[PDB]
């Protein structure tokens, strides 16, 4: 680049590409968010229900039961650990780098565009003020004035479109940063918690729920069997009351 | 139990207990309802995020990247896939049994409870015309009348008095089945979803996470470097505009 017309057309395709940078990057963003958003709301519901079986003891019934709540209770309040740190990495690593795209740079994009605009106004008015002083008699001062504005309105301008094409410049890189160190922030934090997750889910804990799976069928049987004697007792109790 | 009002005495018993095992149940139906809702949302999310990763390429900006994050796009789906699978998984073996408890089971017991109060209410009044009509000179038929209606009101009471302890007593076995049938859905559904997600986030997907950290380390470096190339740039156009 050598000159000001050359620049300022460069400027309009950089600016171009950041409308389209902007918006591909706010859909990103607003995606992630919701990845943010649940996985905070899902660690918070693991541990609350972690949280109410511990508290099955302190139901009062008018022990088995209790120890295998207990044991329930154990195994999921060490997943919602795994989600509880999966949430803090999640912010630090994959939010913030996005909402920092966003917020402060995408920004910064917006607030040198118009402080360029208003430069560029003001030149505009000085260029009409020369036009319109050209057309008439006058002393040296206002025709010294008038130069002299058109001369400083437009060094202004020229330094406000450079501060803007310069981050402008700087976007092209920012957004390869700000595309790329979310997604493997994103991946990291999710390796660790399927690894962790995983490994505690051992063959002890099948051994624990594959009983489970027995208990039950028990209660099934032996609730089928105790309606057939609640229906004898009823026959029989028929009888006792008239 | 030999007659009503043992029976009666204990029927009351297990109403208090059905109560208490309403309150918890319902307190375990809204903490599961709501790893539900955040699962589904989750699933709902990652799979948004793969999808507008894979749009990448359809912004027209005025090749490595796209490269890039379609192998991402490609990760994650796979993870978005496993969350798919627990959702569903949840929906059945989770959500299910314990929606049951509540919508069917309990809803059952308040139920028969209603009728066997009605049938009271309406034993009650008999025996209030009886002790009406013991106060007055009375031909037969209104004293055969109201005596027969004792007798039928009383038998009405008594066999929905019954319908309701079968049912508290079958309420018994269901809660036990209704907390520990969820709880291994749960454990299960999760299993899977751990296993099938560790299994594939290997060793050829940290090479390529590694290689990411190195590439945005790099773009940072030569943005560093052609911001200074960019500020003699403005020096050089600061002479050339005036």
Same mark, same amino acid.
């Given at each position: 680049?050598?000159?000001?017309?050359? $620049?300022?057309?460069?400027?309009?395709?950089?600016?171009?590409?950041?409308?389209?940078?902007?918006?591909?990057?706010?859909?990103?963003?607003?995606?992630?968010?919701? +990845?943010?958003?649940?996985?905070?709301?899902?660690?918070?519901?693991?541990?609350?229900?972690?949280?109410?079986?511990?508290?099955?003891?302190?139901?009062?019934?008018?022990?088995?039961?209790?120890? $295998?709540?207990?044991?329930?209770?154990?195994?999921?309040?060490?997943?919602?650990?795994?989600?509880?740190?999966?949430?803090?990495?999640?912010?630090?690593?994959?939010?913030?780098?996005?909402?920092?795209?966003?917020?402060?740079?995408?920004?910064? +994009?917006?607030?040198?565009?118009?402080?360029?605009? +208003?430069?560029?106004?003001?030149?505009?008015?000085?260029?009409?003020?020369?036009?319109?002083?050209?057309?008439?008699?006058?002393?040296?001062?206002?025709?010294?004035?008038? $130069?002299?504005?058109?001369?400083?309105?437009?060094?202004?301008?020229?330094? $406000?479109?450079?501060?803007?094409?310069?981050?402008?410049?700087?976007?092209?890189?920012?957004?390869?940063?700000?595309?790329?160190?979310?997604?493997?922030?994103?991946?990291?934090?999710?390796?660790?918690?399927?690894?962790?997750?995983?490994?505690?889910?051992?063959?002890?804990?099948?051994?624990?729920?594959?009983?489970?799976?027995?208990?039950?069928?028990?209660?099934?049987?032996?609730?089928?069997?105790?309606?057939?004697?609640?229906?004898?007792?009823?026959?029989?109790?028929?009888?006792?009351?008239?």
């Amino acid at each position: 680049l050598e000159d000001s017309p050359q $620049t300022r057309s460069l400027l309009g395709v950089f600016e171009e590409d950041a409308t389209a940078i902007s918006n591909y990057m706010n859909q990103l963003y607003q995606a992630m968010h919701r +990845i943010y958003d649940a996985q905070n709301e899902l660690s918070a519901a693991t541990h609350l229900t972690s949280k109410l079986l511990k508290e099955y003891e302190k139901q009062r019934f008018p022990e088995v039961m209790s120890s $295998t709540l207990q044991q329930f209770s154990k195994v999921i309040d060490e997943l919602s650990s795994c989600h509880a740190v999966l949430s803090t990495q999640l912010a630090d690593a994959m939010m913030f780098p996005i909402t920092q795209f966003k917020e402060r740079d995408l920004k910064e +994009i917006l607030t040198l565009k118009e402080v360029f605009q +208003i430069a560029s106004n003001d030149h505009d008015a000085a260029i009409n003020r020369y036009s319109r002083l050209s057309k008439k008699r006058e002393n040296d001062k206002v025709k010294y004035e008038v $130069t002299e504005d058109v001369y400083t309105s437009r060094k202004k301008q020229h330094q $406000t479109m450079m501060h803007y094409f310069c981050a402008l410049n700087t976007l092209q890189y920012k957004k390869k940063i700000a595309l790329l160190e979310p997604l493997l922030g994103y991946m990291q934090a999710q390796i660790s918690f399927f690894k962790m997750g995983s490994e505690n889910l051992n063959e002890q804990l099948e051994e624990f729920l594959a009983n489970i799976g027995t208990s039950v069928q028990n209660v099934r049987r032996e609730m089928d069997s105790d309606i057939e004697t609640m229906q004898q007792t009823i026959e029989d109790l028929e009888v006792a009351s008239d």
